[PDB]
Amino acid sequence: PIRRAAVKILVHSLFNMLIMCTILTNCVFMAQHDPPPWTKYVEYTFTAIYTFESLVKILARGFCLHAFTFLRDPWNWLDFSVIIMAYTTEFVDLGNVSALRTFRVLRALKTISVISGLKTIVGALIQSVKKLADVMVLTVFCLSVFALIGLQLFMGNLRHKCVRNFTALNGTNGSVEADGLVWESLDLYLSDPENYLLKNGTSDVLLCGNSSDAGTCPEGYRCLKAGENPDHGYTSFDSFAWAFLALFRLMTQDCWERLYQQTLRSAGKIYMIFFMLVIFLGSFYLVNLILAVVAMAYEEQNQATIAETEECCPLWMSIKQGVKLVVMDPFTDLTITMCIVLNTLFMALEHYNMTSEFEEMLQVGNLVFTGIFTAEMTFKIIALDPYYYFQQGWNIFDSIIVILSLMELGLSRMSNLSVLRSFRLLRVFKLAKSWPTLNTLIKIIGNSVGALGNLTLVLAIIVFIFAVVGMQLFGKNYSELRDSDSGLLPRWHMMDFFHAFLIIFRILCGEWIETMWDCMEVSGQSLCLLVFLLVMVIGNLVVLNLFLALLLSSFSAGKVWWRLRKTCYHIVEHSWFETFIIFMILLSSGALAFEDIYLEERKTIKVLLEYADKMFTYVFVLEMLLKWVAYGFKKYFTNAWCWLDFLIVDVSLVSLVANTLGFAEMGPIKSLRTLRALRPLRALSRFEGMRVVVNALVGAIPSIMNVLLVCLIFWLIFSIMGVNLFAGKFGRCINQTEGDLPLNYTIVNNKSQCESLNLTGELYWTKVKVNFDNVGAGYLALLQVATFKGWMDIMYAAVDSRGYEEQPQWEYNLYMYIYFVIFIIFGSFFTLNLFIGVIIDNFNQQKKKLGGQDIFMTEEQKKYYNAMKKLGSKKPQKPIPRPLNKYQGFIFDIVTKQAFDVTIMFLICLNMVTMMVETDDQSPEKINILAKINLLFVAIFTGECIVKLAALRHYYFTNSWNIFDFVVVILSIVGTVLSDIIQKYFFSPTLFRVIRLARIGRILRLIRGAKGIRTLLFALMMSLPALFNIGLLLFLVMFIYSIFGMANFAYVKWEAGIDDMFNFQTFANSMLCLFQITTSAGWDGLLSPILNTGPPYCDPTLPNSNGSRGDCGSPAVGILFFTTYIIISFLIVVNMYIAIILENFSVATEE
């Protein structure tokens, strides 16, 4: 009949191309927010084509009882759902919320079954998510335990406002409050935002606390616990639903600097030990354990797929011969390859305000280089036939560069897109032939756009699907809700398609929570919670699996003098000598932590460090002099540790001689005695473990220099492009009293209008501090944009662009967002990819050079691993319990059952649930019942404890979990009984808490029985020594930068990032700033006051107690400080990853 004819229609490639064109056109139509009534045509034609497509399918593959074909296929259920949805929506609507249309988008998802083997990529992603399966349950377990720690420590401990003083006024029945105006009731007084403190600069609310460590109220306001909440209401640490969210954003490190720059301000500064626990065990470990299992899963399935796949004539001749002979000269190769270096150095010289004849010489330069390159093209075309010249990797690229640089330049009188200057700028890639590392960065991009080119297309589909789902759902809600006062939407709304795309792009970048707040403020918590977690899990799974795909695809491809020498060698061999030396180095290093801004008033102890310093110098000088003739110059100067000690002793001696003898305080002697912060590095050679760590990092130095040169020469492209696009355009005229807001563009148009109207000295024309003016200044902007910290003020200054030197305007240059999108996709992403891919290979071949293959490992810890691996490998043979008596002999008949063990195991989860239900400011009804059932559970567990003790005499204390069980029992006993002694004591908002935390020791009995948690947690218990060893070096580097910063960065102005409690004024306050920068979190705000100068934003000639004047930090050391601390921290934090993945692979491939 025609069924054989419908099968003939179904198998066309033209039919699949037609369905592709229809799906893509409907994708273009569904991504408009405001459809006009011309959609009577197109929507009916789409639902006609989608009718015709499904009819062709069901005529071939139907009849009635199809459980075998067309409906056991899962991708056709969506196609059937779409057409039945269109047919059930085109008669009559039932609920007119008009959110019905979104399911229509499921049209855009149908193209996964239509294009190619994209149907296999989604199956592989589902295989990897299925493969995780234990990391997820331990993630929710550790987030549960740490959330309960955060409750029993921090309950209600984050609502603290710094309210104004009041009085009960003794004149009414009730609670009248006096603020200089009458106020009714205490409760209504504490609820009005007329009594609170705005922080300086911002518009947050100030937080305080009764503790001695915490933030302090000013001279007239009171620190007490009464208000709404912080951020918008979504950041309190009570109410375990919110504690799980707060510790989850803690785990993915989104804006957590703001979480604990609000926690430590209220709870006291001693609680950064909790954040040092969760950042170094929750975030850095659980995040770096997801990646290991995903990478091992990908490598396993890729290995399986590879394994399964494996199973006229005279003039022409004379002129041609000579030119050809010239062309293959390896010396003429050199004078062009080293000539493009001159061009890219000549274009990286075009700065911000050229001096009107400098620009002419630069144009003449570009013209000369263009002539040199075109002459080369002509000589190589004459050199050999143009069909032979247009062959292979490198001549058509050079032809395209010449014909683009030539044609646009020939359009001499031009409108100018500014791109044309760029057209020449693309030529930097030409030296990838010689350079063996830009070859690999070209291979990564070519591997992403066409050997892994479908997996980026799945990502382009998924980003588009979420940007349409969000635009259809959340789009109308933003409209009148947004504040205006002009007609003015926010920066990160979702009404358009483009803003809807950027807000998904941010969640891919890792910044998701300030959009959840702006979304929950209009759309309710339920939808907005769901969408922005699905985007985060699905999108980061896709982006991460793409990242690992690229990385794997890349790196997959006088005879008493002799006795006098020996007796002096005998004293440095004598162990008490270096035992004295270690304690002397530690004391000499820690003693200079007292150098702070309180050493002027601490006048007494100030001299005690002078004597100490001038004693330590003499001891170390005697040390070097005593080691000299004990070892000889040959053994001493060829050790490369003794050069470090010799350099430090030399610095101390120069400082000493200049200080004592020459009255040498004259000039840069102060800048030389700043350099005595390097004294901790004497310990770097003596603790054997940090010697092992610095050997492992010194060995992998030369690769880092290569990849950093590649990243420098590759960001040079975008820096010259950013100078070409945005030089001078970041110039803002500012009303001074309001501080930090750009002026209206309708009353001040140009800089002429700004500097023309200071009849009063108010208006200041300031640059954004991180501008693109120089090529060197543009590199720091690229560093802030690439590290995902600080880019807001860069993008908002770029998008606001309007001219050359004239006021910015709210969205006058909107589409410049795609420039930073291109930079984050190319620069950050592929840079990081190449960077991790280089380091992994370097550490792998460094392991492939040694003996004992464990790196980051001292010898004694290598002896420890061999005994620690004997503990739990391969399941031990076990003895079986036997009765002894008739009395207790029938008890273990009830106890040793498998039903009793799971009875305890699901009874203790109920004991967890009764811990989860706690709240702040509950009711007195609840504490009584909850405290009664508190003792009830303890009674049950103590009962079964004593039963199992008396049931087995020596067989109790064997399993080493059962010891832990009795320990948790006696901890629960003390935690219940002590509670009654608190009343006759000192202040206890927090002493009872640290006693109450011992009930969480019950929760750690759930891991007895979960093999997916015991295995993967013993993988860290086996990984503690290398983690400890890297940690020493991390603390040491933290210590050295703390002293340099405390020497340099004290007495800066306080603003964006440097408040009264996170500053470089003492050692305790400096450790906290460097701890938040150790995770790269928020270093943008510390640098922003350091880059100041004369007015505004700072003030020189400031009265200063330390004998140093000024209040303005210096940008030269301020940039250097942060920009080398980030890289050093990154490296180490990249070591940690290598140690974790080594111990994971060893346990996994072991059993």
Ligand SMILES: C=C[C@H]1CN2CC[C@H]1C[C@@H]2[C@@H](O)c1ccnc2ccc(OC)cc12
């Ligand atoms: C959970 C950790 C992942 C998140 N970032 C990318 C991969 C890892 C590590 C890194 C981050 O932890 C990090 C640590 C230390 N220094 C960094 C410096 C820059 C950076 O770019 C966002 C991330 C850094």
Ligand SMILES: *[C@@H]1O[C@H](CO)[C@@H](O)[C@H](O)[C@H]1NC(C)=O
């Ligand atoms: C309240 O006012 C009365 C006088 O009207 C005075 O005697 C009393 O001491 C006051 N009490 C307080 C607590 O102010």
Ligand SMILES: *[C@@H]1O[C@H](CO)[C@@H](O)[C@H](O)[C@H]1NC(C)=O
């Ligand atoms: C307050 O005092 C007045 C007397 O003027 C009385 O009528 C009223 O009941 C009192 N308030 C309360 C809550 O009892």
Ligand SMILES: *[C@@H]1O[C@H](CO)[C@@H](O)[C@H](O)[C@H]1NC(C)=O
């Ligand atoms: C505000 O109350 C506090 C009590 O903590 C007190 O120390 C302070 O002196 C009061 N301020 C004024 C202006 O009375």
Ligand SMILES: *[C@@H]1O[C@H](CO)[C@@H](O)[C@H](O)[C@H]1NC(C)=O
């Ligand atoms: C601090 O203590 C005072 C009295 O000891 C109390 O009235 C106040 O509410 C407390 N504030 C906080 C934040 O605990």
Ligand SMILES: *[C@@H]1O[C@H](CO)[C@@H](O)[C@H](O)[C@H]1NC(C)=O
């Ligand atoms: C700067 O701000 C102050 C206070 O808002 C205002 O009075 C002044 O007019 C502003 N300057 C100019 C030039 O308008």
Ligand SMILES: *[C@@H]1O[C@H](CO)[C@@H](O)[C@H](O)[C@H]1NC(C)=O
């Ligand atoms: C600046 O803009 C104003 C328009 O308000 C115009 O009159 C003036 O000529 C411009 N000056 C410069 C230097 O661009």
Ligand SMILES: *[C@@H]1O[C@H](CO)[C@@H](O)[C@H](O)[C@H]1NC(C)=O
């Ligand atoms: C405005 O004029 C005052 C004159 O006192 C000057 O201090 C300030 O630098 C000027 N600002 C600009 C942008 O011209």
Ligand SMILES: *[C@@H]1O[C@H](CO)[C@@H](O)[C@H](O)[C@H]1NC(C)=O
């Ligand atoms: C600047 O002022 C005008 C007043 O005519 C206002 O309409 C405009 O919205 C303001 N600019 C911005 C970016 O709000």
Ligand SMILES: *[C@@H]1O[C@H](CO)[C@@H](O)[C@H](O)[C@H]1NC(C)=O
């Ligand atoms: C906040 O501003 C006030 C007044 O401008 C100042 O006295 C104080 O030192 C500032 N800094 C704080 C509270 O950290």
